[PDB]
Design a protein around this ligand. Structure first.
Ligand SMILES: Nc1ncnc2c1ncn2[C@@H]1O[C@H](CSCC[C@H](N)C(=O)O)[C@@H](O)[C@H]1O
Ligand SMILES: Nc1ncnc2c1ncn2[C@@H]1O[C@H](CSCC[C@H](N)C(=O)O)[C@@H](O)[C@H]1O
Ligand SMILES: O=P(O)(O)OC[C@H]1O[C@@H](n2ccnc2)[C@H](O)[C@@H]1O
Ligand SMILES: O=P(O)(O)OC[C@H]1O[C@@H](n2ccnc2)[C@H](O)[C@@H]1O
Ligand code: SF4
Ligand code: SF4
Ligand SMILES: [Cl-]
Ligand SMILES: [Cl-]
Ligand SMILES: [Zn+2]
Ligand SMILES: [Zn+2]
Lengths: 513, 513
């Protein structure tokens, strides 16, 4: 029994907000779905503003875990009987599942549209039938751009208590998925506590634990070890697996002249094994067997980019695109077995090289959802790689990337702590939303408009309440003007009362009456 | 005599770096120029890495001020005699000045190319002949993307001591220009201390002090008051003036349906005056008289964007582009009198609307340098507008914007302090450099490559030394691994020794021998 400690409350993080749920009925089953959202309560006759909410159920004892909200859905489908358990299988049969309706409601889009996007491979709903605690969400270019937060220990740092805190904290600030990338002690146990306490999808990179199972000797990996690890993780409820099946033996020499070589953790492990034996990647060789596992649980496959560029110098090189071509082949093969797929992308990429990345992925991978690590647009600022990569992530998101893997201020430096997790999630929520606006995604600008209206009207508390991080905005304002009266003042300390342009506009318009 | 206190030393901010100067001779005059740069001293047989340096002369008593390095240049040109004193006038005569050669050396480009860019109006060298302390720099699309830091007091906050600290601090971290936007007490005096202690160009918005001269009553402004303010500021050495001469009477009603109205400080002041009298903007009316002042000192004109959008809702609206059209007219008129010009741009602009901004400016303003405030790509994150705008600034910089006005974490909330100044400069140096890479600017990637080589080779101290903010990178790494031995370890706490991909690549390549 770990010594779990609670994260700050929803109310402390989001003053004037309440957690709400929209109730809808899944017509085929009669199941009632409670789809979460938040409501920001405003002043001055403004209607309350409703926003997305990933924070999940609050104040739940981590020793007990979250309610198993999906239980009746899974039980009913098992009793009906089915050859495959994936959302893509159901979508292709013409079935709108509870998960699809839940996502449609959450996205304010039609359930049939969700079904269509899943059936055609252009969106995924990562939702292992063993992750009963999950509040379903959808990843795809036609939907809100989503953010992943990476957490997990290393052999050098952290603990079970701290990782559970970090999952709850990441989702509080807007993480849409998390991955447990633990490479230290207690891998299985850490992940069990996380899954039972995570309302968002949980991904892993199974080769990390496989390498642990063989005591860090990559040469002792093989398909059988890996297969056992896949089953173990699937049984716990992992919703998606990153698998570097595109790191082919013949692609490894393409990296010999790179400045930063192979920077992918899983990719480097596969490359070492391949070179040791001069054999083809065992995950590639056994792709069909991996698909058979995924079909029984609905584990989505996130096809890794083990040959992603780790420096600006290496961006968009032959190695990177050789792997992308193979990811497309693997994607099409997975779809033949109705397995949900997304593709992992770069990396360190300068801005002028970003469009080529999207163009090639959309074509070669038949519009499967893309999932990028940034990209970082420059190598010059370790300590600020949440900013160097927010630029790339926003750009590639605007071009169609569906899931943005965050990058924290600790990238290239060390394991992120709870503060770094928050900073990364905030930076990535900015990038994702900026991308939603650039895509003219329906109703995305309503958020900006509500905050800007509060800004123009000097409804300061409303402005703070509507923001991504209300207490930061409020505290920053109060550093110079802390008095209650200033929360209704028609200026702040930047310009002062006589130089505030919005107050001058106010008088300008008043005189125009 | 203010109680000036020193900023942290160059050595504390940039370990392993030295300040250096490249000596070149201005052939026409025989004047010897000492053009600053920094040198980062590296290990492992790497050559030292030379980078740009805006920090200026160090450890100089602010009561005494910087050396008047340009004195002999100005004195010689006065003795030769000239009708106009601007770099554009000299460039059009076919003269390569000390300023042009200094900039060429600093940019590693040909002096004739600098002259050509200035003569054609596509670059400016803001360099008032009364700012003798200035180390010349150039702003233009063909050059490194530059960053401006805004400082100054308000009626509500700050002091002379703190503003001088902030100028030295901003330039330490990479600010290429600063503006003294003081709207409180001691405007003249604050600016005098800043100019005498600033090695970078100093800009102002003269209407702010003009409004102060009439006790905050905009209706008591007029050309004469404004003219007196221009002369006062020019005499001190201000290198450029933001003047909102494109805020025309007939454009003001175009803002009536805006969500956030007129958010420009100077623009709102001009609009109030125009509406009060139903008269044309006096700065527009007296444009020719402003040009006559600028020609005697070489003050560059930064044509304001008083109708810039202050919310995503207002982006790229009729008001904004009406003003842009007028900025082009004003630009061409200024060039007829050989006055150097840049144009100010937005603002709050979603990413998909950024290209239109650049396309219109390049055409309508005949490729004059563009100077943007961001743009902010979303309104949702006050407290993090250095990040929301770094995205926009990088994008618009990649498309050709020459000067990026920073935005600090205090934007929309209060007056930035010294910490916020650093944060804004860092974010903007990232955006500017990312833009340099996207433009494939010569030798820009050498910086990224040097840091990435140090990263791959586990030369940790070199990696930190090469970064934008060495002590942040070092401290962050040391939070988990503080021991000296870890500075040569082939891993960090993110992956640990057995999962470090670069170490695995290392072994992979070693085995390949
Ligand atoms: N335990 C953990 N917690 C948080 N992020 C992790 C993590 N383990 C791995 N990651 C993420 O996975 C990455 C792989 S290790 C280094 C990756 C390299 N910088 C690159 O460009 O790809 C880390 O940088 C981090 O982004
Ligand atoms: N004294 C000062 N110190 C630092 N920045 C200042 C400043 N005075 C003005 N500024 C800058 O000038 C801006 C004008 S006031 C508000 C501008 C508004 N947010 C907009 O979108 O245009 C400030 O937001 C800040 O960016
Ligand atoms: O094992 P590697 O380094 O490839 O993966 C590290 C992390 O990076 C994420 N990622 C995303 C895109 N490319 C990589 C991936 O999902 C996992 O979270
Ligand atoms: O008076 P206004 O608000 O226009 O200008 C505020 C600041 O913003 C800068 N700016 C840059 C582009 N548009 C505006 C301008 O140079 C000055 O630093
Ligand atoms: S004083 Fe300036 S920064 Fe503050 S609310 Fe008014 S316009 Fe915005
Ligand atoms: S351990 Fe991981 S994060 Fe640290 S240097 Fe190695 S690859 Fe980079
Ligand atoms: Cl690294
Ligand atoms: Cl504001
Ligand atoms: Zn990296
Ligand atoms: Zn603004």
């Amino acid at each position: 029994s770990p010594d779990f400690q609670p994260i700050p409350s929803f109310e402390e993080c989001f003053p004037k907000s309440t957690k709400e749920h929209k109730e809808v009925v899944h017509e085929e089953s009669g199941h009632v779905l409670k789809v979460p959202f938040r409501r920001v309560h405003l002043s001055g006759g403004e209607p309350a503003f409703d926003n997305y909410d990933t924070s999940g159920p609050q104040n739940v004892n981590a020793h007990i875990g979250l309610a198993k909200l999906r239980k009746e859905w899974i039980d009913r489908r098992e009793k009906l009987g089915t050859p495959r358990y994936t959302q893509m299988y159901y979508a292709k049969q013409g079935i709108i599942t509870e998960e699809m309706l839940y996502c449609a409601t959450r996205e304010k889009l039609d359930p049939e549209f969700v079904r269509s996007e899943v059936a055609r491979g252009r969106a995924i709903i990562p939702s292992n039938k063993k992750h009963l605690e999950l509040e379903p969400m959808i990843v795809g270019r036609k939907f809100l751009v989503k953010v992943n937060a990476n957490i997990g220990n290393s052999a050098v740092a952290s603990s079970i208590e701290e990782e559970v805190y970090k999952v709850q904290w990441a989702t509080m600030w807007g993480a849409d998925t998390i991955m447990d990338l633990s490479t230290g002690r207690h891998i299985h146990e850490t992940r069990e506590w996380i899954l039972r306490n995570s309302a968002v999808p949980v991904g892993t990179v199974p080769i990390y634990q496989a390498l642990e199972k063989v005591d860090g000797i990559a040469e002792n990996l093989n398909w059988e070890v890996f297969r056992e690890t896949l089953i173990e993780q699937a049984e716990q409820g992992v919703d998606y697996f990153t698998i570097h099946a595109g790191v082919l033996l013949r692609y490894i020499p393409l990296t010999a002249k790179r400045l930063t070589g192979i920077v992918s953790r899983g990719g480097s492990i596969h490359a070492k094994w391949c070179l040791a034996y001069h054999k083809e990647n065992f995950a590639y060789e056994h792709w069909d067997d991996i698909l058979d596992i995924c079909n029984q649980y609905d584990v989505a496959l996130s096809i890794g980019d083990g040959l992603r560029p780790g420096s600006i110098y290496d961006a968009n090189d032959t190695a990177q695109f050789a792997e992308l071509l193979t990811q497309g082949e693997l994607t099409r093969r997975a779809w033949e077995k109705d397995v949900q797929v997304m593709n992992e992308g770069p990396g360190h990429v300068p801005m002028h090289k970003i469009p080529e990345n999207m163009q090639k992925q959309l074509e070669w991978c038949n519009e499967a959802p893309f999932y990028t690590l940034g990209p970082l647009t420059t190598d010059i600022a370790p300590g600020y790689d949440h900013i160097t990569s927010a630029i790339g992530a926003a750009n590639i998101g605007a071009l169609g990337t569906a899931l943005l893997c965050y990058v924290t201020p600790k990238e290239h430096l060390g394991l992120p702590n709870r503060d770094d997790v928050k900073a990364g999630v905030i930076a990535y929520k900015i990038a994702a939303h900026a991308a939603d606006l650039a895509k003219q995604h329906p109703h995305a600008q309503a958020w900006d408009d509500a905050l800007s209206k509060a800004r123009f009207e000097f409804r300061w508390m409303d402005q703070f309440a509507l923001s991504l991080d209300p207490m930061t905005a409020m505290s920053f304002h109060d550093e110079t003007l802390p008095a209650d009266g200033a929360k209704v003042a028609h200026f702040c300390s930047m310009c002062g009362p006589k130089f505030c342009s919005m107050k001058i506009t106010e008088d300008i318009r008043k005189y125009a009456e």
